[PDB]
Design a protein around this ligand. Structure first.
Ligand SMILES: Nc1nc2c(ncn2[C@@H]2O[C@H](COP(=O)(O)OP(=O)(O)NP(=O)(O)O)[C@@H](O)[C@H]2O)c(=O)[nH]1
Ligand SMILES: O[C@@H]1CO[C@@H]2OCC[C@@H]21
Ligand SMILES: O[C@@H]1CO[C@@H]2OCC[C@@H]21
Ligand SMILES: [Ca+2]
Ligand SMILES: [Ca+2]
Ligand SMILES: [Mg+2]
Length: 166
């Protein structure tokens, strides 16, 4: 079996769980229950390949983030998520990327930058800004809405396609 281990990281509240639950379970989580560490598994066909996705949904709240680094170690690719209406979460991305590089002991780790909540209009991070950040990291930028499902499959499948290039 072909298994891809994906890890979703980013600031508290950006929509990591809502994204993962939309992908796996096809509904939108409206309430906010902070995550400690949850895992999901699903068999899917991606570009003609039957594979198993193992997705680790991590804590964004500092308080709930005990041993996050330990969980992240096994990850093969990382979704670095911020929210387009949360400037601080975007500024935080650098820190999440650095943590990933530390945990993996590599500067060559498959990643995708994700700007979530694109259904909302209080945008404070413009597409071009996020494109520029992604470009500096050598990775794709994709916008998503866990609410409408826009971009969700694309974000996760793009991460698999990045893992395949490494
Ligand atoms: N409009 C809109 N709301 C969203 C979107 N994604 C998440 N939300 C909302 O944002 C809140 C937080 O989402 P959640 O997925 O719990 O965030 P998280 O990043 O997993 N948080 P934590 O790090 O604490 O576990 C919830 O109220 C959820 O409905 C989105 O794409 N659009
Ligand atoms: O800030 C609180 C916690 O995260 C949610 O994202 C939108 C605002 C809510
Ligand atoms: O119905 C729309 C799409 O899904 C969201 O759940 C709450 C209502 C929103
Ligand atoms: Ca719901
Ligand atoms: Ca290390
Ligand atoms: Mg969560």
């Amino acid at each position: 079996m072909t298994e891809y281990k994906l890890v979703v990281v980013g600031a508290g509240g950006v929509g990591k769980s809502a994204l993962t639950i939309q992908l796996i379970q096809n509904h939108f989580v409206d309430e906010y229950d902070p995550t400690i560490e949850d895992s999901y598994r699903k068999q899917v066909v991606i570009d003609g390949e039957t594979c198993l996705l193992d997705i680790l949904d991590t804590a964004g709240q500092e308080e709930y983030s005990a041993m996050r680094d330990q969980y992240m170690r096994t990850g093969e690719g990382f979704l670095c998520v911020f929210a387009i209406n949360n400037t601080k979460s975007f500024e935080d991305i650098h820190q999440y990327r650095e943590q990933i590089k530390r945990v993996k002991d590599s500067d060559d780790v498959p990643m995708v930058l994700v700007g979530n909540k694109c259904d909302l209009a209080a945008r404070t991070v413009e597409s071009r800004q996020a494109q520029d950040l992604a470009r500096s990291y050598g990775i794709p930028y994709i916008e998503t809405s866990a609410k409408t499902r826009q971009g969700v499959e694309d974000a996760f499948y793009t991460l698999v396609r990045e893992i395949r290039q490494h």
